[PDB]
Amino acid sequence: NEVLVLRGTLEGHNGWVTSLATSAGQPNLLLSASRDKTLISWKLTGDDQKFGVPVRSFKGHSHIVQDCTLTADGAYALSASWDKTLRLWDVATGETYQRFVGHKSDVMSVDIDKKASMIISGSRDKTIKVWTIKGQCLATLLGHNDWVSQVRVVPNEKADDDSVTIISAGNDKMVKAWNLNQFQIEADFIGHNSNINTLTASPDGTLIASAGKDGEIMLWNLAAKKAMYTLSAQDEVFSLAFSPNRYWLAAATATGIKVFSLDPQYLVDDLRPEFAGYSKAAEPHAVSLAWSADGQTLFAGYTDNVIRVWQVMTA
């Protein structure tokens, strides 16, 4: 039934959209990512023209943003980039509470646990490093031999003990899940055929996805740690997306979005629309995606310089 219809975008950046972020406490309060050294804050007013007011740039690094994770409260935006950081931005404002420095090779990430505290970040030095909500390390993990690509938060409804769990990534072709308090050892994902360039997580504590340079999307549990639904999607995803509470997958496969539908096992609905003056090898192929925090609004993002948000509505 669900005819998914393709609508007004929100265009704005000069470089190349490379993440994007579900606001995670004020789902308007969009908050978007970059390549050309900012973060254009887009409202969703919504009211039609502009779908819905590009109200704070935020400028820079010196170099290219690969991320922009919102807090558990959702008004404090956490940077990264190719000049070896963080720089915690204020969503409201233009400012740098705490330069977090220290890496060597080019952050690839950023994420924040359910209370806004013991943050993490991958790298190319081939680690990891915790930097609390101060430029300071708990510790500097080293179990991987590689470019560890991405790490995620998971959002726990066994109501949290308190010695918790997070995750990771990927040229050694593996994952590894680090107690976020005292980085202990828990399981990994063996097998794959090249680069793990992403992963994702459950919106309670028992779901995950990884993904593709091979084609296959190798799925989860964390609270079963057993390898799952093994799909086959040709090119790659660069750019994965849970609906929050539907059971819909969203990931941007080059080519679709393949909604795969992680219950039964079907292709509902592929969005490759809209398109004007190209030689293929121009599509202006994505690099970040999200599901309205409250879970409709897919904020579909693309290279080019035009975000193209595309919600699901009625038959």
Partner: protein
């Protein structure tokens, strides 16, 4: 170098030009500006199926 020889006859010049092994060196450079050198990647083994551990 130029080492002035004061034969009888008439006078000379000598000129030597060593070249140094880029490796044997430490002085700055370890090559020419030309020399581009390459690894012969790695020898990997394919897939299996899925598979995971508990620690």
């Amino acid at each position: 170098a130029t080492r002035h020889v004061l034969m009888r006859q008439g006078v000379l010049g000598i000129k030597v030009k060593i070249m140094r092994d880029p490796a044997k060196s430490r002085t700055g450079p370890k090559a020419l500006p030309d020399a581009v050198t390459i690894i012969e990647p790695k020898e990997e083994e394919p897939i299996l199926a899925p598979s995971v551990k508990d620690y």
